[PDB]
Amino acid sequence: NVIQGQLMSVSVPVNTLVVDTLSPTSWQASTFFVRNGSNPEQDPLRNLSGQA
Amino acid sequence: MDIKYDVVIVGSGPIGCTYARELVGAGYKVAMFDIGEIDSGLKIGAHKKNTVEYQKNIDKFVNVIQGQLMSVSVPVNTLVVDTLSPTSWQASTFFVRNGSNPEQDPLRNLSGQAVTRVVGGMSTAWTCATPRFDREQRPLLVKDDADADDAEWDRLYTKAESYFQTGTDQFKESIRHNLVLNKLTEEYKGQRDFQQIPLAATRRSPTFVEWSSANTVFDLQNRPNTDAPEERFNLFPAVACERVVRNALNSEIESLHIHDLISGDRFEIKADVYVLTAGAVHNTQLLVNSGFGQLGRPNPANPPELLPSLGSYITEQSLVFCQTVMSTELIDSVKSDMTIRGTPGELTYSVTYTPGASTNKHPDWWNEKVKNHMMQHQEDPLPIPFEDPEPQVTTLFQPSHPWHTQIHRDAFSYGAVQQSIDSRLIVDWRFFGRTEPKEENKLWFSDKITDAYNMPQPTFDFRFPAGRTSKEAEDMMTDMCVMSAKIGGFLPGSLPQFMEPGLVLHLGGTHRMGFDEKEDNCCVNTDSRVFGFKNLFLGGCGNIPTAYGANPTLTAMSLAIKSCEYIKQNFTPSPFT
Amino acid sequence: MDIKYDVVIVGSGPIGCTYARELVGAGYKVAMFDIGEIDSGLKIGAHKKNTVEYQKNIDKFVNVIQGQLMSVSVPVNTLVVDTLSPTSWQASTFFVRNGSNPEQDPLRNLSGQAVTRVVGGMSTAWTCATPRFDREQRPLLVKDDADADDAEWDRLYTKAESYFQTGTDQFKESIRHNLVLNKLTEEYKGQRDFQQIPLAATRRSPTFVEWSSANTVFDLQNRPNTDAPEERFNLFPAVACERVVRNALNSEIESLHIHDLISGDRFEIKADVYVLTAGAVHNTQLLVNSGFGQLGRPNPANPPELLPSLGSYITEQSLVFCQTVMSTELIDSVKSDMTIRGTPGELTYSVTYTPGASTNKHPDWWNEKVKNHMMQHQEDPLPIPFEDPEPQVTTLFQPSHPWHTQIHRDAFSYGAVQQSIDSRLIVDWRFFGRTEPKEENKLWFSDKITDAYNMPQPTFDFRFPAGRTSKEAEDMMTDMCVMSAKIGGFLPGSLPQFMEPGLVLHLGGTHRMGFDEKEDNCCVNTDSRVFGFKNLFLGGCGNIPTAYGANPTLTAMSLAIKSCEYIKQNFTPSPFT
Amino acid sequence: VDWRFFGRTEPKEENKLWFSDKITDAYNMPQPTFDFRFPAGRTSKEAEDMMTDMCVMSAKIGGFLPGSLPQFMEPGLVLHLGGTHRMGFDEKEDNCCVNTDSRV
């Protein structure tokens, strides 16, 4: 927990995971937009995802 | 295998079997084709749950369901696997892999939508719930005459219920059923009515229910046969029906193009009457492959010549789900009439009740079951008998609670931790919302991508409409949370949730019915006849044009029965020589 | 429903069907009972994988397997659920719930052991791998004459291979098959031999394999019939066989007690010859229920009168598994003979090769498939055709590598992250260990607890023996890790692992064969006749007394053939009337 | 017992850490971006050989613990990143940033 608490990921690609069980009332995206500190420059397939 | 029949029916689900029952019975020479194969035992197209092994182990039945359901449209997968060995081959892109549909926007899908290809269709695995629609959910069959419309629906529903062997009595002596039914009846006294879910089923013994299916409607045996020597029927499994051939005037179908998947032979089959009952998705595909509507990505700057409403106004229900673990209060209430002397397991443990007494909260049949269970199974901490059938409760859709409800048990794959909980305690909650038909909600077919049978790939463009549909959906979730709390708290791992869109498999509206093609934005009339065409009929839930919450099959069947009336009035059977 | 037959067979799996084929063919009046039902389509007891739907979507077949397998012994569940609502009924103990077996020590189980109750038995779902056993795995049929023993096994295996339609050529032109086969051949040149897994299967087209089953062995149609007017066979599904009735001398069976699960009636069936082919677990259960061996927890202070070795010396194979993702080097090797010019998706793109060139690493049939795939699908990054069949590779058990291997694909439920990986890249690895027979490893039956058919509840007392069995199992894991690395790295989510004990379903030795009851600690002789009884025979994997790694069914069938030879020489068919 | 085997990675010009001229990180600095794959050839072959070596060596001590089966870890979780401002004798000839006194 100490290790995890301090390590901050260097580059997180844009997330493309589909959540399709939201309630119909909830605000939902039409695109996988740049969200939550993600790096749109980052090719998810050419990353060091574990770098922190 | 002739290639000339009076009537050809595509699909051997319950709706195809309705046409078969009516038209075989009326003396037509009928052929039925199904792309799937016979796999329910000696009873062709029968319910797969009607084996002794599945009646002993219901939850294993989820595997049957899963095994037959094939996802309609799976978007290209973009999940990152970045812990492959460096030696393993990897693509540099998320390429079209594994049958995925690159046309599909993953965020406007009915990802849970699936199809079954087997003789008997989805009715070899369905849950058998067959409620009628009230007016609010129901398409009109009679204009400007509400009482005539009512009367017509009643006649058709009553017949449909007879074909399906629908009843509301098969669970009447279940302790769990009555516990839940009685409690909710009391809680909503003067506010909502509860009853048994109407089920297409016949109980055969205290531990066996014969669930209905396509077989119940029509046994699917070739005719003539000893029991039906004057009837004429052939079923041809493993035959892919690919297209209907239109005449140049677009007034009649001239033939049905088929591909025998076993022999590989192709034929053109001629009939007087062509009936498409391949399901809401595949009827649509067949029609598009035949030059109805439009192939490819919808382009409103080029509307198609035939059936411009085909594949628009699609509806699928919102589904919320949870399970509950029965309250202590309710479990204790089961044994309320019991006098318990001694400690269980020891010498003079006794459990007694007075038959027929007036302070008894429960009927004798109930207390006798409870007594014998508590006495013969002193190691067991619950008062519910081990073989007590499950609850099957509903409060049907009403304007003040515009969703269908099922408070019951069906096949479920419990996690190991959930299997920690005694099954007698668990109740499933499924509430089903109605979805407004909107033109923008579409099922379309790729002009480049093809499916597993080399047909144009189905693609959804779907979102639950804003406004009433979405507000009701959320109100329905809250209702489930409120109502279920009267019975018990949520089972961990089965917390209240919306199901993946389309997992419900109540898709409607893909080839929708109405009085007038243009005014009502529709594809078939009230005889289920394709506008403009003398001799082409569509059957199934794709016909239903309304926003409905209740399970649609009985309604589709009723429409089919009306369609068959038109056929019997307009086409003459060939003489049986 | 005569009450008198020449031969009665309990079970309609492939072993029961071996007896049927032999004895029906030899003119015996045969009845066969199965507790399960007919549900493989028109071909009774056929392989469920032989539908066009499953040939197109093989991974969905996992559901068929799971849906029919019922766990043999499930220990009491001690998982803590502590997030229930305070209103929900909560246990104070881990009581006997949900069909769990309180006799079962959770730490000495075969938790993966399961049984199938359907017409055709497990052969409706099996993987069809039918290797022969080499001497080291194989029980003796001839003592003190290895050559005679070899010849007898050869004769028997050859017939069994004919009954199953075993072959080694159904995947001969698969690219993936040969890619793997060739690499492993080269990597182990002079050390190990590789070949196609011998499979009970007939290829019908490039995309259809008709997998063998019980139906292949005997079609299970009642006889006499048009094709077999002089034969006499009746199959009676949904009939629980409960007991064989011993005479007081314990020298003869006098009848078979059955329970019709549909009518609910019990009957006694008389036959000259009684054959128990109910599976390794249920043959044992039937015998124990009939007074053979010992009911209840074994007590060495109180050995049973009849068949003291029954249910002891049980064997089940260790199984290790992983999947791999094909190496870049191997994938690139697929197209080694190609000249690639231009760039994909353009006019200029050219993929060509020279048929017959001596420098080619691959045959023309391979290069043609590669060239067409690459030219016709320029958007696809892989050189393997979409419809290329799977690998089916083995190196068979040898003293220096005392495990069976399967390097192949079979139905698998890939997680969504794993579905990210193109299926063409994936190979399954399954290595099967041999287990020493030890008297302490037991299948026994409760005197108190009953199963779903009201029969004594099976209970395992099992651990993999120390010594050779354990050393070899770990050595086998390592060999899998080493060998698989030559093909590609592990697929995340399918990392090298031991499978749950018994999931393999290769249980043997529960009613084991030997020359002498006492000396060889056994229950049947080499004719599969129960010691002391004139007219009682056991068939199946329970007969096999050795430590074996290879798939056992072919060996069990071979023994059944030999058993039938004895039956044919010692009992006379009734005259056909 | 935990088993961790660490491979060596060939330095290749194409494997880069670069910084966005538009996106910024939590401290308003140019956002780091990786363009990295394990080099083909020696690096990759050795990585796989290393996996096999772990499988072989670990079995001498005991079998794998379920849930901690042999696996590659997520790239960079190791945090042994090197060569981003690398040392050499000659800036041009050795493709480097600091000399052997670590002087730029």
Ligand SMILES: Cc1cc2nc3c(=O)[nH]c(=O)nc-3n(C[C@H](O)[C@H](O)[C@H](O)COP(=O)(O)OP(=O)(O)OC[C@H]3O[C@@H](n4cnc5c(N)ncnc54)[C@H](O)[C@@H]3O)c2cc1C
């Ligand atoms: C698990 C489950 C639970 C359900 N529960 C309920 C419930 O409780 N109540 C309810 O009302 N509904 C329920 N349903 C839905 C119900 O099963 C369907 O509404 C109903 O079966 C539709 O009937 P159908 O005859 O129109 O189509 P289907 O049953 O889908 O049959 C159509 C058939 O046409 C075939 N076919 C498709 N394409 C072609 C082609 N090109 N050529 C030839 N044949 C083709 C198929 O192989 C198939 O057998 C459930 C379904 C599932 C699977």
Ligand SMILES: Cc1cc2nc3c(=O)[nH]c(=O)nc-3n(C[C@H](O)[C@H](O)[C@H](O)COP(=O)(O)OP(=O)(O)OC[C@H]3O[C@@H](n4cnc5c(N)ncnc54)[C@H](O)[C@@H]3O)c2cc1C
């Ligand atoms: C997924 C799967 C993969 C497999 N792969 C392979 C393979 O690759 N190679 C191989 O060699 N083996 C494999 N097997 C094992 C193989 O299927 C069995 O060894 C074989 O089917 C055993 O044949 P049997 O006739 O003795 O028994 P079973 O096939 O088990 O048939 C026994 C039958 O008797 C019945 N029965 C049970 N109790 C009673 C009773 N009291 N009364 C009446 N009937 C009764 C059953 O309902 C059943 O049909 C696999 C099995 C499965 C499930």
